[PDB]
Amino acid sequence: GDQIDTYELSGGARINRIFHERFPFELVKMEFDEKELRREISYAIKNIHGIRTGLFTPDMAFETIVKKQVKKIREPCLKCVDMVISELISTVRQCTKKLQQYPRLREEMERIVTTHIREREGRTKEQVMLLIDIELAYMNTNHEDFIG
Amino acid sequence: LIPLVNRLQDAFSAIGQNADLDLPQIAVVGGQSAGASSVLENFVGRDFLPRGSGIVTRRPLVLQLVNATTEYAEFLHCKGKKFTDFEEVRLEIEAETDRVTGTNKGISPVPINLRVYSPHVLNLTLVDLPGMTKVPVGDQPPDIEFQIRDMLMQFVTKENCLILAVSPANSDLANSDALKVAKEVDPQGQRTIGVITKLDLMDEGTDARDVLENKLLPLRRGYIGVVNRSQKDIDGKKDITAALAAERKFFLSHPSYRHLADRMGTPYLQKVLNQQLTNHIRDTLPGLRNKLQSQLLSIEKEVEEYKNFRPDDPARKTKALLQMVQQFAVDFEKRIEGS
Amino acid sequence: SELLANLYSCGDQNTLMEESAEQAQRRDEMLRMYHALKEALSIIGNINTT
Amino acid sequence: PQLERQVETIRNLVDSYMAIVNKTVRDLMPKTIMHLMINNTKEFIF
Ligand SMILES: Nc1nc2c(ncn2[C@@H]2O[C@H](COP(=O)(O)OP(=O)(O)O)[C@@H](O)[C@H]2O)c(=O)[nH]1
Ligand SMILES: [Mg+2]
């Protein structure tokens, strides 16, 4: 549509593209000490070879480190979802409270919309969990790993 | 009967969890000798508040109600003391007031924190604030009015807080300070509820029909009229039951209020507040439902064995034995081989 | 191959596999929690229906 | 006419984008099945 706010703001749900370009920041806010990674790998190897003498590096020493690293990203995804919900609520308020002079109507039309939004919060979080859970279920080395 | 929101509060207490309902703070703002402090007494249902003509509410009182199976009160400044006779709670409030403000009609912004436990109360926060005045007396400083407003603004300018504007009936409504404050902080009327507290003392020949019908100063949520206990009745320790019966008789008899009789009095105010709170938690429930369902999903898979538990069940014992022996053999093999 | 055969040979098979007190207390607490939790969801249901 | 130059450009972008989609599908289909059909079966058996 027309009548865009060319001067005053960067706004009107274009903030959500910042979350989609801000979540790539949360995914790298996390850091680890390499010495703990090395210690954990050493113990993973020593714990995979239980009594046997090792000839080749076991493949579970890779898988059990990757799963442990992958479990860390559950939190920032939920933070992203909550931020998106916050922006939807703010947008509904702008489209409801500022343009309507009738009492009671601007309450029903905000309450109903934000209730529907919260229910979709529920469904969205379930789908995010069923995506990260899938990332753990299988290790795929076919597409872009360091091919020998 | 108990309203459904109290049924939820009972169930949440009954499950020993920290999940709870998010309810607004309720502030009652009036004016000097308006009677605001006497309204909370009837709302809560226990005659523990200090009362009487003059400067009686000197410090803001923060009263928190908690749902519990034992009825009692506690103070933060009286640690470990379980009060069961509220007529000593009154004395502790007066003593704590005098300890800080002094006896010469002083005030202080520091609140008194009281917690009351009872079986069918929500987790509401109630604030009894000192009334506004124009003329300083009793060594109060010349700016007493501004300090009182400064105390009020820290409770009535917050969001998610209801404002009950208490105005007397015998004093012309245009002079009411509570309506001025509510108007300043709630221009739209979404949060303000008005109450007319002294219809008993109207000058003979007049009435307040033009106020209770929301015509003289239209307010979005209307006005509720009440009749409270007079100074003599409190000095005579008249039972709350008699006061409520007298109020009902007053409204039924008075020729100018019969058609409003079913919208007035303390219990109607209770119904209105319950409806406002009930409509305040809508659009919050989906989160509680999702958390409760998640816990049920994580318990239901296990409690199936418990529901049919019997002290004599050889099949349950046999299968438990087989599963534990299997788990032992597998755990030992994994632990020593490393597989 | 043998462990279960030996377990069937121990004691009198009457006191073996007898629950401790702690499991009984946990059972009671879990059943109480289950029933109260279902009640809470019933009340939320009724409130949303009105 | 210059319109043909626009059409060719769109085609190239579509092919590029579709390549990315193909990778995702190839990646997510194995992982999905392992999660829902094979690992639930092992957990059932054990
Ligand atoms: N007759 C009559 N007196 C009332 C009524 N409401 C309040 N009062 C009197 O007004 C006094 C002052 O109100 P109070 O309860 O002290 O709270 P305040 O507004 O902080 O002074 C009360 O103590 C009562 O004696 C009423 O409905 N009828
Ligand atoms: Mg007072």
The 3-state secondary structure of A1-66, one letter per residue: CCCCCCCCCCCCCCCHHHHHCCHHHHHHHCCCCHHHHHHHHHHHHHHHCCCCCCCCCCCHHHHHHH
**CB of B167 closer than 8 Å to CB of B176:** yes
Residue B120: Cβ within 10 Å count: 12
Calculate how far, in angstroms, residue B221's C-alpha sits from the geometric centre of ligand 2: 24
Residues in CB range of B338: below 8 A, 6 or more apart = A47, A48, A49, A50, A51, A52
CB B65 within 8 A of CB B126: yes
Bridge-based pairing state of the strands B25-29 and B125-128: parallel
Chain breaks in chain C (C to N over 2.5 A) after: none
User: Element (H or E) spanning B253, and its range?
Assistant: helix B240-253
B168 alpha carbon – ligand 1 mean position (Å): 9
The angstrom resolution of this structure is 3.6
Across the interface, of D23, D26, D31, the residue whose CB is closest to A138 is D31
How far apart, in Å, are the Cα atoms of C28 and each of B174, B307, B316, C21? 63, 10, 18, 11
Beta-carbon neighbour count of residue C44 at 10 Å?
A: 20
Q: For chain D, which chains pass the contact test of at least 3 CB pairs under 8 Å?
A: A
Given a contact cutoff of 8 angstroms between Cβ atoms, the answer to whether B155 and B86 are in contact is: no
Tell me the chain D residues in contact with residue A142 when contact means C-beta distances shorter than 8 Å.
Answer: 26
| Least Cα separation, residue A132 to chain D (angstroms) | 11
D30 inside 8 A of chain A by CB = yes
Using the Cα atoms of residue B297, residue B302, residue B306 and residue B310 in order, give the sign of their dihedral: positive
Handedness of CA B297, B298, B304, B310 (dihedral sign): negative
Q: Are B7 and C43 in contact (CB under 8 A)?
A: yes
B290 close to A122: Cβ distance less than 8 angstroms: yes
Q: Alpha-carbon distance B120 to B13, whole Å?
A: 11
- CA-CA-CA-CA dihedral for B272, B277, B278, B282, to nearest 10: 140
Neighbours of C13 (CB within 10 A): 13
Question: CA–CA separation, B58 vs B105, rounded Å?
Answer: 8
- For residue A92, give the nearest of A70, A62, A69, A112 by alpha carbon: A112
Which tokens hold the place of A91? 């947008």
Report the separation in Å between the CA atom of B57 and the middle of ligand 2, taken as the mean of its atom positions. Answer: 4
Strands, sheet with B223-225, edge to edge from the N-terminal-most edge strand: B78-83, B72-75, B112-118, B61-67, B125-128, B25-29, B161-167, B192-196, B223-225
- For tokens 């109903």, what's the residue? A112
Structure tokens at B73: 């009160």
Task: List the structure tokens of D44.
Answer: 């059932």
**Angle subtended by helix axes A105-137 and D3-33, to nearest 10:** 70
Question: What is the DSSP code (8-state) at residue D43?
Answer: H
Q: How far apart are the first and last CA of chain B?
A: 62
Pull the structure tokens for residue B236: 């005579």
Chains B and A touch (3+ CB pairs under 8 A): yes
Amino acid found at A127: Q
In chain B, beta strands by DSSP E:
25-29, 61-67, 72-75, 78-83, 112-118, 125-128, 161-167, 192-196, 223-225
Look at residues B120, B156, B148, B163 and name the one whose alpha carbon lies nearest to residue B273: B163
